[PDB]
């Protein structure tokens, strides 16, 4: 009797690549490139364990202009130039890049608290700031090569910045193809998502969002998204198929968001299998386990994630030591293998980039004794995403209707319902009657909403030059 544990970690970055100018606005495409992208799939060199990854095709796209060396990324130049060269808008983007990310353990350089209380900063100690901020975000591979570099913490010389910008880039050029090796030995399954990561269920029909917030104001939708939403599917087949050679039968859907019409389009597209939220499914169904695999009206199966596994390791496992951690987690895994008695499909899914920078030495002690552990428990068996859709003594239930939602609270209301965030979707709209070309595509993202109508925070009026530039270059 095993366990069937199955992770699927959700990669993805909006078009940061500003239409007009053709500049990378924000780098956080490369730093995520750098310290994860490569470096989450590269775990499964060393470790027998099955991992599944989702990649959107709007991040894919960035890392072939990375790889591509076509990325003109305004603050990573400001990183590579002399410091003699700089200007202080630039110094001073870096000194705010710096604060944004300074209490995090990957920014634990002694070196960062003493350039942060300084009045001025010299040439040398620019370079510190410059060099520190790329090692900051140094993956596991490079952790080991760049050790010297590493443990020196301060005096960095333009070479040796250099130097980790090349080993950067290398690990950006190896980053599709270690996605296609995990692929095709068999080590993980590669899903994807509707192209730039948009709420389907809103395209789809906006008044769904009413299901969970029946208080909810949304603007007038007088122009129809349901092409858009089609469109958003199968772009997303076609660049899968580009980069791996077939169409993709397993997708994410962005922020876990179904609906029945969504499901509906999932399956009419020919996706075989998704997950979402344990939430919808508390939502949907009274007596609802989310250990068996689930068919919804018998057209598209689904798989319900563990929200408690996916959150430890979201939201507690950072601050916590490494084996407290991973015994835990053990643990909670052997509770549930002892109280059912058939075999429970367990889905682990978050987002596979954004928690490590919270861990100490990037969480690479905390996966490194997880994968470990895991890989040594006879009663748990690892699946990728095609193991777990086509395993056959895996318990099964048929559902006929989900309640529309996200796993944000179950509702829509992170990215529609109040008056700032209502302003983006009536921009959109206004743009959607007048739109010549895909950037109207662009700009149904789920990242814009996201950010707008928050409380002011750091460099989130990029994104909102992103939108309105794609919204603008939509109707040219
Ligand atoms: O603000 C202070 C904050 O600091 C830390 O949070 C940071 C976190 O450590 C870091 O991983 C990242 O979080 C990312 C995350 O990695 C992504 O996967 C993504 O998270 C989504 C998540 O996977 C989904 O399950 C869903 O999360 C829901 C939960 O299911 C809800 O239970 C609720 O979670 C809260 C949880 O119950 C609490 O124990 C507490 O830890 O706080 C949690 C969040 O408030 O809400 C979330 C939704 O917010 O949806 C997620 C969003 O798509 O995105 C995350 C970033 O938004 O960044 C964090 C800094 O924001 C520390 O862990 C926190 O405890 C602390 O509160
Ligand atoms: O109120 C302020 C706010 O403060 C804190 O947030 C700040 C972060 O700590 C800080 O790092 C910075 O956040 C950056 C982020 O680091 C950067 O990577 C980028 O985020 C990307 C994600 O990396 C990417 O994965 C994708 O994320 C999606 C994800 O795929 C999806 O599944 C789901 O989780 O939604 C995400 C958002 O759509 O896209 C985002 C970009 O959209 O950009 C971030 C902003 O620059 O700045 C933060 C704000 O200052 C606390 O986290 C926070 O709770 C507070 O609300």
Redesign the pocket.
Known sequence: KKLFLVFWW?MHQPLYREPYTGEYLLPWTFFHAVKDYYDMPAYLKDFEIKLNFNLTPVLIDQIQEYAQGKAKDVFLEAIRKDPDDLEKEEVEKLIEFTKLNYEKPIYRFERIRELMNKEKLNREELLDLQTLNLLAWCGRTLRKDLKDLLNKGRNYTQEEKEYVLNKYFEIIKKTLSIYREIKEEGKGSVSTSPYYHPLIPILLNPNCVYETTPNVKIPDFAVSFREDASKHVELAKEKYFEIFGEHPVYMWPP??SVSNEALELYYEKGINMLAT?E?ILKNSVERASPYLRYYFRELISVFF?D?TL??LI???Y??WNAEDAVRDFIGRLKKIHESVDFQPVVFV???GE??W??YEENGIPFLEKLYSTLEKEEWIETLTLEEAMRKEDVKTEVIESVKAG????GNFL?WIGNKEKNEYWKILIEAKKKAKNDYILVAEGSDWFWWQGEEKAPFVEVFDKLFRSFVRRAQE
């Open positions: 959700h922020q876990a939220d939430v994630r929200k996916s959150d979201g939201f507690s950072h601050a899914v978050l987002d954004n928690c920078e919270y996200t796993w944000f609270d992170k």
